[PDB]
Structure formats: C-alpha cells, structure tokens
Amino acid sequence: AMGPAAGQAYDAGNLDVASSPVKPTLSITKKTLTAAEAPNAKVTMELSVEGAADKYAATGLHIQFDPKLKLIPDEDGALATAGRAARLLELKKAEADTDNSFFTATGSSTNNGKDGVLWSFVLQVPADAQPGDKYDVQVAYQSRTTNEDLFTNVKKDEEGLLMQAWTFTQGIEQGYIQVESTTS
C-alpha cells in the first residue's frame, strides 16, 4: 500500500519520483493483542526495510507513537536495537527525541544495508487499554538541519535522491498496537 510518512510533506522538487529505480518500503509492526493480555503489555515492535538490499546506507528515521504508549529502554538502557537489515552498516545509533518519539540513524562506507528488520524496540500499552483501542506507531518526516530524515546511498547521487523521495512520499507502511475487538 503506497503512502507517505507522517508529519510534514517531503519535498521531491522536480524529481520524477515514480521513476525511482529503487523503491524502498519501510514498515512498522501491525500488532493485535487480546483484550486479556493488552493492559500493561510490553510489545516488541519492528521497523523493517524491503526492496532496498545493497542500495542504501545513510538513514535518519524518526519514529513517533501514540502518547499513551511508553517506550521501554532495555536492560542496557538502549532505546532500540539494530536488527539483521543493519548487520553490515558500520554506524548505527538510537537516541531520545521527545516523550513520544525517538530517532535512529545508520551510515556506512559502502551501500551494504539489507532488507529485513532495521530496528527493534519495545512499547508498553496503558493499564486502561480496552477492546477496540488502537495506538498508531509511525515513521514521521520533517525538514531539519540536524538529525535529518534520510534514506539514501553513500554518494547521494540521483539514484539516492530518488529512492529517498520514494521512501518518504510513497514507501511508508505505518504500524500500530491494537486490542482485539470483542467477538460475537
């Protein structure tokens, strides 16, 4: 399903975005919980990459979530952990942003990003969660001078610019945690 990042519209300028040779999809877990397990559930969520293996390296990705959810750092204090998609990338970091968002960044000397799970992280569902409740978890974009939102290759050539424009305008599959609705 084609869609943009949340937040501010990406400026693709005069690029013919739909001609992008590389068309990444970034997707976040769509998790359904039983009403029984939902309250206070600590849910493992994944940001994944498809369609970009061997074509990227430099990423800057802000993940934002329903303010009722809480980001749970792990036993080392890490906000997220890089997955198999990032296994060859030389630089990987996850860091605080706002009370309902965090920032991730990767880099490398060659385009050795892969498909698969880029980042894994844990969000906790509130104690009052009810059947039907849905909490969105999203990649968000805005224009920045530091911690830029990026998804591109080491040279940032035309192919890198096009794949980035594709990613943020059409290649985002947003996720959520939702509580199963009562069956009848």
Domain extents in the chain: 1-184
Give which of 167, 149, 155 is closest to 63, Cα–Cα: 149
d(CA 153, CA 1): 24
Structure-determination technique: X-ray
d(CA 99, CA 72): 12
Find the angle CA(129)-CA(132)-CA(135) to the nearest 5 degrees. Answer: 60
- For residue 121, the surrounding DSSP H or E stretch is strand 116-124
d(CA 80, CA 46): 9
d(CA 51, CA 54): 9
Cβ–Cβ < 8 Å for 166, 22: yes
Torsion of CA 86, 80, 30, 10, to 10 degrees: -70
State the alpha helices, DSSP H only, in the chain. 158-170
Resolution reached, in Å? 2.0
Start-to-end CA distance of the chain, whole Å, equals: 30
Cβ–Cβ < 8 Å for 150, 60: yes
Give which of 169, 117, 99, 113 is closest to 139, Cα–Cα: 169
Find the angle CA(115)-CA(70)-CA(89) to the nearest 5 degrees. Answer: 25
Beta bridge partners of 93: 105
Which amino acid type is present at position 40? N
d(CA 184, CA 64): 34
d(CA 175, CA 61): 15
Find the angle CA(64)-CA(29)-CA(45) to the nearest 5 degrees. Answer: 70
**1-184 has which CATH code?**
2.60.40.680
Task: Give the tokens for residue 139.
Answer: 């990649």
State the alpha helices, DSSP H only, in 76-134. none
